[PDB]
Symmetry: C4
Subunit: 385 residues, 4 copies
C-alpha cells in the first residue's frame, strides 16, 4: 500500500536520540566500511542507513582516501539503523558517487549517479531493478541529495543539480512513479544555488532545505506540489545555517554573501513561519551540532530564537546532516515525524590520517521533553593507519 503524504509534521518541543552506530570506533578492529553521507530513510516497516563507500574498510591501505571524490569504486549501500556498516550487514544498492533513496510504501527507490563528470548518469532502481536512467544535461557533474527523497500519494520526488559548484548552476526537480521519471521541471532560480537537498513531505507537498556552495551562508529552499509547481527562497533567519558562515547577525531572504562561499549538507524543518534549524556549532569547521528553534525565522530576519538543543559539543567533529521522515503508516501516528541524522566526520582533512569516514547519530521529533548533550564520534585518531 502506497504511503499517503497528506498529514502534517508533528508538533514537537525537542529531539530524542534515535541511533548511534559507532562505526569508526568499531571499525578500528572490525570490518567496517569507510563511508560518507550516511543518510537514513524509512519504509512502512523499518528504517535503514544508506551510505556511500569507496569500497574500502577502515584501517586498510585501501582507505588511502587521496582518490578523487567521484571514483568508479563508489557504491551506495544500506544497513539497518544504528549498525556499523560492514560488508557483512550491508545490502548493495547501486554503483554511485552521489545518491538518494526513499520508499513509496511499496518498494525502495534508489538513485545512484555515476560515470564521468562530463556525462554522469543517474540510475534509478525500484525494488533493486533498474527502472529508468537520467543523463547529465549540462555535462558538469550531475548530482543529487545525499539523503532520503520524499514520497507522497505513490509518487516520489528528488532534486538534482548539474553545473558549477561556484556560480549559477541548473536545478531540476523530478517526479517519479515506480522508479520512472514521469515528469521533471528545471527551476528558474537565478542567483540561487542548490546542492545536496534535504527534502521531506508535509500535507501533500514537498519541502527541501539545501546547501548553497556558491554564495550563501543561509540555506536556500524549494517546495513544490505533486505537479512540480514550486516556490523558492532562503531561510531568512539570522541564525545562519550553513557552515562556514558569519556570526549570527541580520539574516535575509536571498543568499547572504559574507562567508557563505562554500558549505555542508544540512536541513531545516519549516513550522508555519518558524524554523527548526540544525547546524554546526562552529562557524568555520564542521565541528559541533545544535538544533535551534527560531519561531518565525523562516520569513523574518533576527538573530533571536527561543530554544537551543545541543547535539554535539564544539569540541567534537560533525559534518553532513540531513533530514528523514517517519510516515504514519510506519508509526501509527496521525502526522509525519521529522527526524534528522548527523554525520560525524573523522580524518582528513582536519585530522592527520590517510583516510576520511563518518559515524552517524540520528534524532526524532517528539512532544515529550529532551535534553541537550554531546554525542560525538568518540574514536581515537590516528589509527594503526
Amino acid at each position: 500500500v502506497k504511503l499517503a503524504g497528506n498529514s502534517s509534521l508533528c508538533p514537537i518541543n525537542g529531539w530524542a536520540v534515535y541511533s548511534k552506530d559507532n562505526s569508526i570506533r568499531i571499525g578500528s578492529k572490525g570490518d567496517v566500511f569507510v563511508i560518507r553521507e550516511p543518510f537514513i530513510s524509512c519504509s512502512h516497516l523499518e528504517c535503514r542507513t544508506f551510505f556511500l563507500t569507496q569500497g574500502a574498510l577502515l584501517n586498510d591501505k585501501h582507505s588511502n582516501g587521496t582518490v578523487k571524490d567521484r571514483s568508479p569504486h563508489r557504491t551506495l549501500m544500506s544497513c539497518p539503523v544504528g549498525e556499523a556498516p560492514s560488508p557483512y550487514n550491508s545490502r548493495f544498492e547501486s554503483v554511485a558517487w552521489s545518491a538518494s533513496a526513499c520508499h513509496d510504501g511499496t518498494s525502495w527507490l534508489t538513485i545512484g549517479i555515476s560515470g564521468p563528470d562530463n556525462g554522469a548518469v543517474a540510475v534509478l532502481k525500484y525494488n533493486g531493478i533498474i527502472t529508468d536512467t537520467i543523463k547529465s544535461w549540462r555535462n558538469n557533474i550531475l548530482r543529487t541529495q545525499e539523503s532520503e527523497c520524499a514520497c507522497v500519494n505513490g509518487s516520489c520526488f528528488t532534486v538534482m543539480t548539474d553545473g558549477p559548484s561556484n556560480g549559477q548552476a541548473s536545478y531540476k526537480i523530478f517526479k517519479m512513479e515506480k522508479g520512472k521519471v514521469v515528469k521533471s521541471v528545471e527551476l528558474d532560480a537565478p542567483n540561487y544555488h542548490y546542492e545536496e537537498c534535504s527534502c521531506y513531505p508535509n500535507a501533500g507537498e514537498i519541502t527541501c532545505v539545501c546547501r548553497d556552495n556558491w554564495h550563501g551562508s543561509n540555506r536556500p529552499w524549494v517546495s513544490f506540489n505533486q505537479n512540480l509547481e514550486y516556490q523558492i527562497g532562503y531561510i531568512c533567519s539570522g541564525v545562519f545555517g550553513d557552515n562556514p558562515r558569519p556570526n549570527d547577525g541580520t539574516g535575509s531572504c536571498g543568499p547572504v554573501s559574507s562567508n557563505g562561499a562554500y558549505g555542508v549538507k544540512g536541513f531545516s524543518f519549516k513550522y508555519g513561519n518558524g524554523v527548526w534549524i540544525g547546524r554546526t556549532k562552529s562557524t568555520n569547521s564542521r565541528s559541533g551540532f545544535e538544533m535551534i528553534w527560531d519561531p518565525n525565522g523562516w520569513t523574518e530576519t533576527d538573530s533571536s530564537f527561543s530554544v537551543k538543543q545541543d547535539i554535539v559539543a564544539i569540541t567534537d567533529w560533525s559534518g553532513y546532516s540531513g533530514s528523514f521522515v517517519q510516515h504514519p503508516e510506519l508509526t501509527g501516528l496521525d502526522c509525519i515525524r521529522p527526524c534528522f541524522w548527523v554525520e560525524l566526520i573523522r580524518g582528513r582533512p582536519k585530522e592527520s590520517t590517510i583516510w576520511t569516514s563518518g559515524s552517524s547519530i540520528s534524532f526524532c521529533g517528539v512532544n515529550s521533553d529532551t535534553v541537550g548533550w554531546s554525542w560525538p564520534d568518540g574514536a581515537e585518531l590516528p589509527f594503526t593507519i
Copy 2:
C-alpha cells in the same frame, strides 16, 4: 495477540543451563562487542540477549574502559541468545547507558536512557519507533532495571530511580501500553533503596527484587497490581543476597546494614513464603554464583535453607544477574517459566587489563532435575591488550 500474564510461576526443583555465549573467549580474535549487563528477554517466538556497549570491540584500543560508565557512546543492542554480540550479528536497539526491554505479545518495548546526569532522558521505543520520553525528575542520574521489564494483559511495567545511589532516592513504577506511559506512581518508601530491579510477572501482578546500593545486604522488593497499587519490603532471609554482604547470620525485613552499603544487580523468585535466591558465592567479590532455595525465607529470618545449586565456582568471576521469564504463549506451558542470566565479568577492576566486559550464561526453571557445576567465562587474561 497480547501476552496474558495471568498464570503463575511454574513449580521448579532446579535450574538447567539454557545458554552460554562464550563472548569473551571468542572475542580474543572475533569481532565481539565489549559489553555489560547482557540480560535476556523473550517474546512469543524467541529470546534475545540485550546488552550495552561502549561501541568498541574486544582486543581493540577503544575498549580502554577508563571512560565514565555513562558515556554518550553506550548503546543498547540485542542479538539471539547464546551468540557472541558482534556488529555482524547484533540489532541496534537504542542509545543508552541504562535500559530495559520487554515484549508484550505484539512488539518489543525498549527503554534506553542517555543524556547528562543532571537530566537524563529515557526514550521509550515500540517496534523500533519512539513512542514516549521520560525526563529525570531529580536530575541525578535517572536509571532503570538493566533487565527485562514485565508485561501483563497488554501493559508493560518497569521501575526507575532518580536521586542518590547513597542515601534516600526517588523510586517510581511505570505502566505503559504500546510504548506510552499511561500511569506512573512514586513509591512512598522512606528508608528503602531500589536500583536495577529484576521484575517478573506472576498471576497478573509484578514482583521485583532489586539492589539496595545505599545501606542493605538483603534485597528490597516491590510488587504491584496492574493499577500500580503496591507493596514493598525486604527479603528477610539470613541468606543475604546482595554483594558485598556479611556472612549469613540473622536477616531482617528492613535493610541489613552490615556490609551492604554497595551492591550488585540480582534477582529472586518468590514462591509462597519461600525464595530462590540467586547470588554470588563470595561475600566481598563478584565471584561465583549459586542458587538457593530457602522455603519459608521471604518472610522469615534464618540462615537455613534446603537447597544450594552451584552455577559458578568461587574461583571464577561473576557479576550482574537478572530474571527473565518465558510466557506460556511462547512455551505451550500453563504457567510462567522463571529463568535468569548471569553476567561473567572479566577485566577491570579485579584484573590487570585495560577493559571490562562480561560473558553470559542463563538457566531456566524446570521440574526434572539438574546438577550444580561451574560454567565460568573461561577466557585467558590478559589479552593482546
Copy 3:
C-alpha cells in the same frame, strides 16, 4: 505437519557429493569456530550442520585445546550446510559437550548434555525452549549420538549411554515427543557396547549403527519399533567398519575383539541383508574414507563386497562420520534419502599444533551414477598457532 517415517530407504548405486565447508582452510584468517562432530540434520525445509565448539576460534590462543573434552564452554550450535561455522552465521542451540538433534516436521529437537562426569544432565529443547531433562543414571559420563536422532510419526528417538568406555556400560533408548521423554528402555545387551550411534528411520522403525569402544572392530547395531521393542547385534561382514580394526578377514555377528579396543563415530545403511558401510581407509588411523557395498554382508561373514567408492584418500585425515536422512516431506521422493557426512579432523593428536578442529564433507544416496574421488580438508598446517 509431523514427518511420517513410514517409507523405506531409497535404492541407491553410489553417493553424490552434497557439501564441503572448508572451515579450517577458511579458518586460517576468517573467524571460524574450532569444532568437532559437525553432524548434519534436515527438516522439512532446510538441512543444517550442527557441531560442538569449545567457544574458541581457529588461530586464537583459546584454541589451546589442552582443555578437557568435556569443558563447561563446550556448546552445541548450527549453521547452514556447507558454510564455515562462525559466530556470525551460527545459531546457538545448547550448552553441551555431547549432543544430538533432529526435526520432527514441526520444530527442532536438540539434546545437549553438560555438567560434571559423575552427574551430567541432558537438556532437551523443542524449538529452543527446554522441555525435558535426563540425569546420568550411572554417574559416568552420560553421553549421546553426536549425530541426527530419528523421528517417525511425530516421535523422535535417540540412544544415550552411561558408564565406562571400556567394559560393560549402560545403554538406553529414549522416545520423546515435543521434546519430552515419553518412554525409555535400557537395552539388555550383555557384552555389547554402544557409543555415538548413527540412527535413521526406515519403514516406521529406527535402526542405529554405533561404535563399540570397548572390544569391537565391527559396529554394533540396535533397531527398534515406536514402542521401543528392539533387537540388537553386530554387522557380521568381514569388511570391518570400526577404526582401529584388523585387515578384512572373517567377521562375526558379535564383537570382533582383535584390534577392536577403541573406535570412531561411524554409520552404515542396511538394505535387506546387505550393508552400505562407510569407514576410514587406514586400519590404525583416522585417515581416508570409502563407501563399500557388501550385499549379503549385514548377516554374513565375508571379506568380499561388490562396490567401493573412495571418498577421502588414505594420505588425508578423516574422523567421525554419521548418517543423516532427507525425508520424503523435504524431497518429494516416495522414500527416505540416505545421506552421510564425514568429519575431517586436523591438528592433535596426529599433527604438531595446539588445537584440533575438523571440516565437513557430505554425500547423499542417489540412483544415477557417481565417481569415487578424494575430498580432503585441504588446510596447510601448522597455523600461525
Copy 4:
C-alpha cells in the same frame, strides 16, 4: 509459478551500471573469498551472485593458488548481488570446480561438477536437494557454463563439453525439469569448439554464445528450441569477440583461426541480424572491456559497427563476462531484460602475487541512455601476500 520464456529481448540502446562488489579491495582486510567466474543469475524475486571458490580467503596463505584449477576444495556459492563474497554472507550451493545455475520461477537449479578429470560428475540440485547426476561421457574434463543456464516454460537448459580443450571435443545440450535431465542431445559440430557457454532465453528459444578455445577468434553459438532441435555457427562479424584475437578485420561464419587458438568466456546478444558484442579491449590480454553494437553483424562480415560503449579501460584488468537475464515475472516489463557481468581478475598470471581472484561488475539493458566509462577492480597489488 514457472517462468515463461515466451517474450523477446527488450530493445535497448546502452548499458547502465547495475553492481560492483569491490570484493578484492575489501578482501584486503575483510574476510572475502578468493573467487573466479562470479556469474549473476536471478529469480522472480532477487538476483544473486554465484561464484566458485578454493575455500580460501584473500590475504591468507591458503590462497597460494599454485593449486590445480580443478581441486576438490573448489565450491559453488552465492550471495546477494553487489556484496563481497565472504563466509559470512554466502550460501553454500555445491562442491564444484565448474558450475551453472538458474531459477525456473519456482526454485533454483544448481549444477556443480566435481570429481577427477577422467570422470567428473555433474551434480544437479533443485532447491538445495540433489535431483540427478550426469557423468563425463568422454572422461576428459566434463565442464559447463560458468554462467546462468536458461529456463523457459518450466524447463531449464545448459550446455556441457567433454573432450580436449584443443581439437574436436564433444558437446551436448541438456534439458531439465525440476533438476532432472529429461532430454539431452549431442551437437553434430565437427570443426566447432564449444566451452563456457553464455545462454539466454528469447521467444521460447535459447541462444548461447560460447568460447572456442581450440582454433577460433570469433565466438561460436548454438540456438535451440524446447525439443533440443538446434542450429550452430559462429558470429560472422569482423569485430572478433574472443581474446586473444586478431585486429578487427574480415571475419567468417566459421572459426577464425588467426590468433584464436585459446580464449576467454564471453557473451553476445542477438537482435535480428545484429549483435551486441561484449569483449575485452586488448587483443592479447584480458584487459579492458567494451560493448559493441554491430547491427547486421551476426550474419555478415565487416569491421564496421555503430556503437561502442566503454566498460573498463584498456589500462585495467578484466576476465570472464556472461549474460544473465531478468524476466518479466521479476521486472514487470513485457520483454526479457539482457544484462551482463564482468569478471575483473587480479593477481596471477599477470601480476606478481601468489593468488588470483576476481571482482565483478554488471550492467543491464535499458532504453534510456548511458555512458561509457571505466569501472576497474581498483585493488592495489601486491597484498600483504
